[PDB]
Amino acid sequence: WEWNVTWNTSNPDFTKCFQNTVLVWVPCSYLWVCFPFYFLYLSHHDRGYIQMTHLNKAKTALGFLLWIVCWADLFYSFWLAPVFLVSPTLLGITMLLATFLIQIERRRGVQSSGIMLTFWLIALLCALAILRSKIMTAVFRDVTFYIYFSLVLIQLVLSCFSDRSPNPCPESSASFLSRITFWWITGMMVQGYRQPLESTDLWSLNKEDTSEQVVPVLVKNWKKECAKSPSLFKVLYKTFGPYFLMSFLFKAVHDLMMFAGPEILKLLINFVNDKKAPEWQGYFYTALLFISACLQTLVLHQYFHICFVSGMRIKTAVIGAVYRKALVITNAARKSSTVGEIVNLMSVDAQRFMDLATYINMIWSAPLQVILALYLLWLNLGPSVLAGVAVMVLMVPLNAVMAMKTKTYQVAHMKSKDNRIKLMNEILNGIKVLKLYAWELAFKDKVLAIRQEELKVLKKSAYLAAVGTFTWVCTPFLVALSTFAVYVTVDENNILDAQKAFVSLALFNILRFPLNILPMVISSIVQASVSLKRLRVFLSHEDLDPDSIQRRPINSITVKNATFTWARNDPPTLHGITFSVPEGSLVAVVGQVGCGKSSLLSALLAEMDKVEGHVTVKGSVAYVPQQAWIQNISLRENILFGRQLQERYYKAVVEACALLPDLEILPSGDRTEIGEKGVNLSGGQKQRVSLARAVYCDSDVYLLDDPLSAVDAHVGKHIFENVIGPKGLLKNKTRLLVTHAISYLPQMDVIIVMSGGKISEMGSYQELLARDGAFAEFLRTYTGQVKLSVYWDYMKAIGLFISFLSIFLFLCNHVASLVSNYWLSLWTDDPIVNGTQEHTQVRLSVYGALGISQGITVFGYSMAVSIGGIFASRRLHLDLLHNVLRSPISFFERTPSGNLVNRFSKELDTVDSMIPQVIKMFMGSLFNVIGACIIILLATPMAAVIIPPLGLIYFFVQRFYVASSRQLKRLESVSRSPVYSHFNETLLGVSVIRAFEEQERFIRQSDLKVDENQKAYYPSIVANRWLAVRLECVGNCIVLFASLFAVISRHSLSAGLVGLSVSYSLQVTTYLNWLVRMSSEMETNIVAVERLKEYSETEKEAPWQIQDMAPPKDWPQVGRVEFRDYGLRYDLVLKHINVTIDGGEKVGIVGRTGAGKSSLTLGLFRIKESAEGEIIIDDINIAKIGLHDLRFKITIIPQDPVLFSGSLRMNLDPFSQYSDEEVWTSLELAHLKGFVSALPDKLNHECAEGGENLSVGQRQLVCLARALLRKTKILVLDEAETDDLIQSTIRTQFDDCTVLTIAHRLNTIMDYTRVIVLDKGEIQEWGSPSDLL
């Protein structure tokens, strides 16, 4: 090895000894170090054995022949040089290891072998180098090498094809090349462009990615850890750590390869410096740069794939284990953890684990990258690098402090947003009463105040985000300027050549990311630490005793000397209970409140903690809980409960529970979506469903914990007759019922009466009555791409001046960056005379000036984008609120309240906290690309020939990525919510699930939902990897072309220009993809703006204030109402209405369901526009008057009074227009002075959502107080205990005012003269009740 023939000569030939030693030791050596390690994977991971195919044999036969040929050399050598013995033997032996390896790979079922392929690629390159040398030298030993090379080439070609296998995910069947360069998802991207993607188009999860695979492994490892009485981290890295080990390896390789880049750039700069260097050296350097960049791309995205897959495995396993634990944990643990905390364990903790696994390897990669970059910068610049290190040491803690303060601001913003969302939910749930009361402006002002607090904290967060963008963008320049200034100023002979400038710039750009992610990674580790503590606490919770009850398959229920607890430390709730319930007997638990009736049924289900005794419940148990648990599935599936539908049995169960009227009122019948999310049901209906579900399940033992609490007396008696009674559906079933109603007690076979959780003289009804003891005492007790129009809409919401100022500032920022780097290039070209550079302080001053301009302009554009985002969020929230409050009631009835809430929640978030940062990221990911391309084209104009082709590539790739990514993302977005929702359901009805033994069915359902979520999430991240690989190699193909054109025209190019072009190309690589990912984020984020502005063109209500035809104060002077040919369409509910209500004349409206009674009040308040009608109050038409005016001059007491959160005074007078004396007088006149004076907060009593603290009677009297305080001449009443009080109060002082009354009860309407009867909208009778009869 000497430099004359290998590097100095125009023919780069390797020496003969080098050829025969190192070029042969490289490939053989690769297989020798990998072979042992590869058994780990081959053994731990198995997939069967592949059959005998021609391909596998072809490879094995060529491996045999190749070994022979290599040993044939040893034979000829045996037939002087020491290398002519060891090298052929070694090659033969490693070849024998290669053929054995494909053999064992066949045995272990691997279709594509990364090792064999790479190994053959390295062998091929080594053979190619020797081949070229041997063909340039020119029989004896050469022909053996030609045979070796041809066989190696054919072996390499064979190794690319995938062998036979031993809507699935194509990742498995994918070849090694298809796996490293993600190609099995190309079909998904093309399909997503051509057709919309649905959940039916998504591939089935990998068998190792499925919940049924990952969750049991974690559960087993947790069981092992808990048996060794517990570290959840130990379990986590014992279960997923093995798989994550490869990411660590890939992470290291990427770090080394990414530092190779600046070294090769240094070599290229040195090559351009000397004009006597052979050109092949420059082509070798650019090939090395291209190869290292492409390798770094591959290993990096393989590392990312491993990290993301491991994060999935962790999230799925954690979710499954949490679900199973919740299915097994005891009542004390559930009481400790509430409900939202457990769902938080299922959502935020598992998501934190996944997001952490994405970047946790940085906790070591970032320090190692920093150390390596600092050492290379030292090698370049001496001790002058300490200035840049000092700048970094200043900036990184600054970034951490700003991140902590941003977290504080986000906590405050979340609190204020939750307040706003609560207020908006109460506004939407009660918008009818708001519009009827003309209260839209007051609640608008309330929401605006909450949003003002939210916008203040958002503005502070925006200031912080702008400073953070400034620091992140301008820290590389600060480091470069500090190190360059110190370098040139400490020593006059410190020459700043291109080698010491642009290589150092590349090193600073390498340093930029790790420094910025290290604080974030440490914060993520701390958050994952607290989340891991929460998960470990939940998974260490006490498990319920499964055998607490004997659960004997088919004296039916046996309890002897059994005492139960609700907690180990807590005293017993049921002391010394004994009773035997025979098969097919009706037993009623009897007691007072807090006696221990429900505790008995909980104890029979192994929900109580049994401190002593023996319970032997025989056969299946159907539990009807006191608090009805309703699944969000349809009512039919609620009753079925995952059971085969039997039409006769179902249709016998539904009416026996008297569920037929409930089915009739509900829109879709039994297919209606009952539950919290769907249609809400009354308590009695929920008890009916629960009882119907229990009856359909057809158990032998029934535990009915007060099934008839909320059903009415007639409905309850009917239910008992057809279901629970001896002549009902459950005649032969053992029914244990908890009741406090005597009506059905004589029909009960056995009455278990207890007191204070103790058995107290149980027996039959007649015998217990005869005994005259405790029972007698008890009885005596009583699509396409988002349009540019919405981008322009967001730009206008920001403000055209702010948006265009930010665009100008960003353009100035990158112009300054480009000019600063060009100035550095000119600086590096400064000649050396007398050992120094003449122009240093001028160059340094201009570099610093350009950097200061860049910094102030970066701060400027970050400020402009951040502030414009605040402005846009304010404008969009105001417009959305105004449009919502102006839209008619029909709009709220039509549109589900879910999407209306999803406009003020999430969508505002996307607009205010996400869109500005995505805009900032896109601007950079775009102008970094533009500046790099401009620099490359200006330095090497010929590089314009590769801009079109690669650009075309970019186009197509971007297209497919975008056209699929959003779809995948939206699929992911629709899959995450059900899982937690399901968990919530499982947390609410865990007692029901345990009693019905449906734990496995719900575990499978949770596995399904998670698997659907992961089936949406996996294609998304693999899409990210696909886009990256393609466009990063595209950017790396440019790096190649930029360096190649630099070496082609090196004689007319300076070293500074070459270094500049190559450095800028090195980074355009890390951005062409981020440019697309950010374009996709823009497309998927601007839709939020589109959904915010969608109620802007819908039909709105008539103007609230006309101000041209406004009425005079006291417009209803007497309140003379006249319906002149009124017609209202909800075809016409109201028709031919010609009635006249005189001023101060009491008038009521009677009619059956389906008449226009209520719709008539909607006519008075103009809720629905008059299809044909001229309602006139006194001498003024209603339709001409603005809405607010009439809504203020007419008052209405609706069916269910809606009390809004806040003080009582804000309920009575939201505008605070009426004085305190008027409020006090009205409250006293409303029979409420005694109660209202009782609250410690006086008039400022904080009533919760809907006035839950207040009683129904009180809320009704508060609504009456509102109407009384209004002091208007026209009042409407909507009637459904306190009825005597509200009726007397409406009859007390409102005799002066004209009162319309719609009552479903004839008793009250009889008092009012002039009754109007509505048959089907027509006026059936118009006269006084005396003329009625």
Ligand X SMILES: CC[C@]1(O)C[C@@H]2CN(CCc3c([nH]c4ccccc34)[C@@](C(=O)OC)(c3cc4c(cc3OC)N(C=O)[C@H]3[C@@](O)(C(=O)OC)[C@H](OC(C)=O)[C@]5(CC)C=CCN6CC[C@]43[C@@H]65)C2)C1
- For residue 1253, the minimal CB distance to ligand X (Å) is 30
Nearer residue to ligand X within complex by CB, 521 or 797: 521
The answer on whether 1156 is annotated among ligand-binding residues is yes
Regarding beta strands 1323-1327 and 557-565, do their DSSP bridges make them parallel or antiparallel, or are they unpaired? unpaired
Cα 25 to Cα 3, 19, 20, 102: the distances in Å are 21, 10, 9, 21
Instruction: Report the amino acid identity of residue 782.
Output: Y
Is residue 1026 a contact residue for ligand GSH (CB under 6 A)?
no
Two tokens, residue 1059: 């270094």
The answer on whether 1010 is annotated among ligand-binding residues is no
Please choose which of ligand X, ligand GSH, none residue 472 contacts, taking the beta carbon within 5 to 8 angstroms, the exact cut-off set by kind: ligand X
Regarding beta strands 621-624 and 701-705, do their DSSP bridges make them parallel or antiparallel, or are they unpaired? parallel
The answer on whether 621 is annotated among ligand-binding residues is no
Nearer residue to ligand GSH within complex by CB, 514 or 1056: 514
Distance from chain centroid for Cα 829:
53
Among positions 900-919, residues that touch ligand X (CB under 6 A) are 909, 913-914, 917-918
Is residue 1204 a contact residue for ligand GSH (CB under 6 A)?
no
The answer on whether 591 is annotated among ligand-binding residues is yes
Please choose which of ligand X, ligand GSH, none residue 909 contacts, taking the beta carbon within 5 to 8 angstroms, the exact cut-off set by kind: ligand X
Please choose which of ligand X, ligand GSH, none residue 191 contacts, taking the beta carbon within 5 to 8 angstroms, the exact cut-off set by kind: none
The answer on whether 1152 is annotated among ligand-binding residues is yes
CA separation for the pair 600, 563 (Å, rounded): 10
CA separation for the pair 234, 248 (Å, rounded): 18
The answer on whether 138 is annotated among ligand-binding residues is no
Please choose which of ligand X, ligand GSH, none residue 924 contacts, taking the beta carbon within 5 to 8 angstroms, the exact cut-off set by kind: ligand X
Burial string for 1277-1301 (b: 16+ CB within 10 Å, else e) reads bbbeebeebbbebbeeebeebbbbb
The arrangement of strands across the sheet holding 1121-1129 comes to 1132-1141, 1121-1129, 1176-1177, 1180-1181
Burial string for 786-806 (b: 16+ CB within 10 Å, else e) reads beeebbebbbebbbeebbebb
Among positions 331-370, residues that touch ligand X (CB under 6 A) are 355
Tell which one of 607, 706, 1081, 1101 touches ligand X (CB under 6 A).
1081
Q: Any idea which residue has 């509430």 for tokens?
A: 338
- For residue 1025, the minimal CB distance to ligand X (Å) is 13
Nearer residue to ligand X within complex by CB, 521 or 751: 521
Tell which one of 84, 513, 822, 871 touches ligand GSH (CB under 6 A).
513
SS3 1015: helix
Tell which one of 287, 412, 769, 921 touches ligand X (CB under 6 A).
921
Tell which one of 304, 502, 794, 847 touches ligand GSH (CB under 6 A).
304
Q: Taking contact as CB under 6 A, which single stretch among the options 363-371, 513-521, 587-595, 1136-1144 is the one that binds ligand X? A: 513-521
The answer on whether 597 is annotated among ligand-binding residues is yes
The interface mask with ligand GSH, positions 456-495, x = CB under 6 A, is ----------------------------------------
CA separation for the pair 201, 194 (Å, rounded): 13
- For residue 471, the minimal CB distance to ligand X (Å) is 10
- For residue 178, the minimal CB distance to ligand GSH (Å) is 20
Q: Taking contact as CB under 6 A, which single stretch among the options 136-144, 273-281, 1073-1081, 1204-1212 is the one that binds ligand X? A: 1073-1081
Nearer residue to ligand GSH within complex by CB, 514 or 1214: 514
Please choose which of ligand X, ligand GSH, none residue 1024 contacts, taking the beta carbon within 5 to 8 angstroms, the exact cut-off set by kind: ligand GSH
Q: Any idea which residue has 């099934």 for tokens?
A: 707
Distance from chain centroid for Cα 608:
36
The answer on whether 1151 is annotated among ligand-binding residues is yes
- For residue 1038, the minimal CB distance to ligand GSH (Å) is 18
CA separation for the pair 710, 705 (Å, rounded): 12
| Contact between 673 and 1032 (Cβ < 8 Å) | no
Distance from chain centroid for Cα 21:
57
Burial string for 72-95 (b: 16+ CB within 10 Å, else e) reads bbbeebeeeeeeeeebbebbbbbb
The answer on whether 593 is annotated among ligand-binding residues is yes
Q: Taking contact as CB under 6 A, which single stretch among the options 42-50, 674-682, 921-929, 1247-1255 is the one that binds ligand X? A: 921-929
CA separation for the pair 837, 1110 (Å, rounded): 85
The interface mask with ligand X, positions 399-438, x = CB under 6 A, is -----------x----------------------------
Q: Any idea which residue has 């009741």 for tokens?
A: 739
CA separation for the pair 178, 171 (Å, rounded): 8
Q: Taking contact as CB under 6 A, which single stretch among the options 101-109, 243-251, 510-518, 1265-1273 is the one that binds ligand X? A: 510-518
Please choose which of ligand GSH, ligand X, none residue 281 contacts, taking the beta carbon within 5 to 8 angstroms, the exact cut-off set by kind: none
The answer on whether 613 is annotated among ligand-binding residues is no
What residues does 1129 pair with on adjacent strands? 1132
Nearer residue to ligand GSH within complex by CB, 443 or 1074: 1074
Two tokens, residue 896: 């589900």
| Contact between 311 and 243 (Cβ < 8 Å) | no
Among positions 242-271, residues that touch ligand GSH (CB under 6 A) are 258
Is residue 364 a contact residue for ligand GSH (CB under 6 A)?
no
Is residue 1084 a contact residue for ligand GSH (CB under 6 A)?
no
- For residue 870, the minimal CB distance to ligand GSH (Å) is 25
Is residue 1074 a contact residue for ligand X (CB under 6 A)?
yes
The answer on whether 1154 is annotated among ligand-binding residues is yes
Please choose which of ligand X, ligand GSH, none residue 917 contacts, taking the beta carbon within 5 to 8 angstroms, the exact cut-off set by kind: ligand X
Smallest Cα–Cα separation from 312: which of 1170, 1065, 1011?
A: 1011
- For residue 303, the minimal CB distance to ligand GSH (Å) is 8
3-state SS of 483-533 is HHHHHHHHCCCCCCCHHHHHHHHHHHHHHHHHHHHHHHHHHHHHHHHHHHH
The interface mask with ligand X, positions 968-997, x = CB under 6 A, is -x----------------------------
Regarding beta strands 1121-1129 and 1176-1177, do their DSSP bridges make them parallel or antiparallel, or are they unpaired? antiparallel
- For residue 408, the minimal CB distance to ligand X (Å) is 11
Counting residues that bind ligand GSH (by CB under 6 A) gives 7
Helices 16-44 & 83-107, crossing angle to 10 degrees? Answer: 20
The answer to whether the Cα torsion of 162, 166, 168, 169 is positive or negative is negative
The answer on whether 596 is annotated among ligand-binding residues is yes
Is residue 310 a contact residue for ligand GSH (CB under 6 A)?
no
- Local structure of residue 671 (DSSP, 8 states): G
Tell which one of 599, 1024, 1069, 1258 touches ligand GSH (CB under 6 A).
1024
- For residue 349, the minimal CB distance to ligand X (Å) is 12
Overall residue count recorded for the chain in this entry: 1333
Smallest Cα–Cα separation from 1101: which of 900, 893, 886?
A: 886
The answer on whether 932 is annotated among ligand-binding residues is no
Is residue 791 a contact residue for ligand GSH (CB under 6 A)?
no
**Enclosing H/E stretch for 1070:** helix 1055-1092
- Please, is 1217 exposed, middle or buried when counting C-beta atoms within 10 Å of its C-beta (0-12, 13-18, 19+)? exposed
Binding site for ligand GSH (CB under 6 A): 258, 304, 365, 369, 513-514, 1024
Where on the chain is the footprint of ligand X (CB under 6 A)?
A: 355, 410, 465, 468, 472, 512-513, 516-517, 520, 909, 913-914, 917-918, 921, 924-925, 969, 1070, 1074, 1077, 1081
Residue ranges of the binding site for ATP: 591-598, 1151-1158
* Residues making up the binding site: 591-598, 1151-1158
